[PDB]
Design a protein around this ligand. Structure first.
Ligand SMILES: Clc1cccc(CN2CCOCC2)c1
Length: 460
């Protein structure tokens, strides 16, 4: 039985509005409704992994697991295995996988982050799950961010707290937050960003939605505008939105948006908005293709509609050779030529690099770089030809060209990372000097760049 080099992943996000679900929710898992929808000819084909995020979920874990598993069994005639379930307050994540994947899945990690302080601590935050699928690391974050049209900055702050403090993946990757720990990271939830138009325009917005004319609404979506201004979700991707706003509906129909201020809303308007979203970030040059992104039309218990997204995702096998794992393979090496970091910092410590990769027995520390002044004010840290030669565990190009090197640039004075990035080994050539590049971030914000040349030796 061959190991896969692709899987499909279902992501769902649903703010249930504290109400039990209706008796049938299969349209959600079938990617049927509005937006980019899944072909009918695929209905019986199970996804490999289903990741379900709920917010305002009133059910026990047991109650929801029974609904989810029976829903998938009805669709696919497969009894899915439960990989993980984690709940913070009424924010929940469930991971289900086809039984054939049970021995391919390992290193399962769950965590949560509570956002806010005092007033603002007690119902918002995030849950997450990570695991290995053969040679590929997968992370999944379900967040419920701060509500209200005039709180986009609080949402951005919530995002940064979650990516700093959610403890998923390989704890040996100490300099790296969740935005660098996974081959594929999916971040979804009730992110609660709104369409920023005047309240007086509510009926105009509703008109536009009835005409399926979303362009003038999406141009005011706060998540798209904040992302374009690099205020949040830097280096994440989102499929184009082609479904109606998923909030705020009158319950038991989808015919009416309920936007007017009420005591129950704290006297706040809820203009129709794309609160419910799926984003992802994958390592450079790894296959990831969104195959659906939409909302259901027939699940009406909540004031939100469920959102679905599906993905093809490249995966690799758990590689064994006659040498590594358990030793190096002298036929493999990774060299860096003419490398330099450009940093936005005003500080003047010496810096060194750390190279982290599951193709190395352990991480590698460089010598300190040489600091120079850039012509536009910047710190340039030069490594020249001084970077250590990296010794991979396996030299076979079928393995090595699918790997990635994480880079942290650290202060010699404090050993704190000033920037993190990632370099793909999926090169155009081996034994050839080739340009490399990554942006550097710290706490998910841009802090600089790393560029230079690489030379990769494989056994071929
Ligand atoms: Cl699908 C799945 C569900 C629950 C746990 C696991 C991890 N496994 C790996 C091998 O079997 C034992 C534990 C996988």
């Amino acid at each position: 039985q061959p190991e896969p080099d692709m899987i499909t992943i279902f992501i769902g996000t649903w703010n249930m509005g504290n109400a039990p679900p209706p008796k049938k929710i299969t349209s959600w898992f079938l990617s049927k409704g509005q937006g980019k929808t899944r072909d009918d000819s695929a209905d019986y084909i199970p996804h490999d992994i289903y990741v379900i995020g709920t917010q305002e979920d009133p059910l026990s874990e047991k109650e929801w697991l029974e609904i989810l598993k029976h829903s998938l069994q009805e669709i696919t005639s497969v009894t899915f295995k439960t990989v993980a379930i984690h709940t913070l307050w009424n924010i929940r994540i469930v991971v289900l996988a086809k039984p054939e994947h049970e021995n391919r899945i390992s290193h399962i990690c769950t965590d949560n982050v509570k956002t806010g302080i005092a007033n603002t601590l007690g119902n918002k935050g995030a849950v997450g799950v990570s695991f290995m699928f053969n040679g590929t690391s997968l992370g999944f974050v379900n967040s419920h961010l701060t509500s209200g049209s005039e709180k986009k900055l609080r949402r951005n702050q919530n995002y940064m707290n979650i990516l700093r403090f959610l403890a998923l993946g390989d704890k040996k990757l100490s300099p790296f937050n969740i935005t660098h720990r996974f081959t594929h990271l999916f971040w979804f939830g009730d992110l609660n960003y709104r369409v920023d138009l005047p309240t007086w325009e509510a009926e105009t917005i509703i008109q536009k939605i009835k005409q399926q004319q979303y362009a003038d609404l999406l141009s005011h979506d706060q998540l798209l505008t904040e992302r374009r201004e690099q205020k949040v979700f830097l280096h994440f991707e989102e499929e184009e939105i082609t479904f109606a706003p998923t909030y705020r509906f009158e319950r038991l129909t989808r015919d009416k948006y309920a936007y007017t201020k009420q005591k129950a809303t704290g006297m706040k308007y809820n203009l129709p908005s794309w609160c419910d979203r799926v984003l992802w970030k994958s390592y450079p040059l790894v296959h990831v293709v969104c195959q659906s992104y939409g909302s259901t039309s027939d699940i009406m218990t909540s004031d939100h509609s469920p959102v679905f997204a599906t993905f093809e995702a490249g995966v690799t096998s758990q590689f064994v050779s006659k040498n590594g794992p358990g030793t190096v393979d002298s036929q493999g090496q990774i060299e860096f030529l003419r490398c330099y970091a450009t940093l936005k910092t005003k500080s003047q410590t010496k810096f060194y690099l750390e190279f982290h990769s599951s193709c190395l027995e352990s991480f590698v520390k460089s010598q300190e770089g040489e600091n120079e002044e850039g012509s536009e004010g910047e710190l340039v840290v030069k490594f020249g030809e001084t970077l250590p030669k990296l010794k991979p565990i396996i030299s076979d190009p079928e393995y090595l060209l699918d790997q990635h090197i994480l880079i942290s640039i650290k202060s010699s004075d404090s050993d704190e990372s000033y920037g993190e990035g990632c370099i793909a080994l999926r090169l155009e050539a081996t034994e050839t000097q080739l340009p490399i590049y990554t942006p550097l971030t710290h706490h998910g914000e841009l802090t600089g760049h790393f560029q230079g040349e690489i030379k990769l030796q494989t056994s071929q």
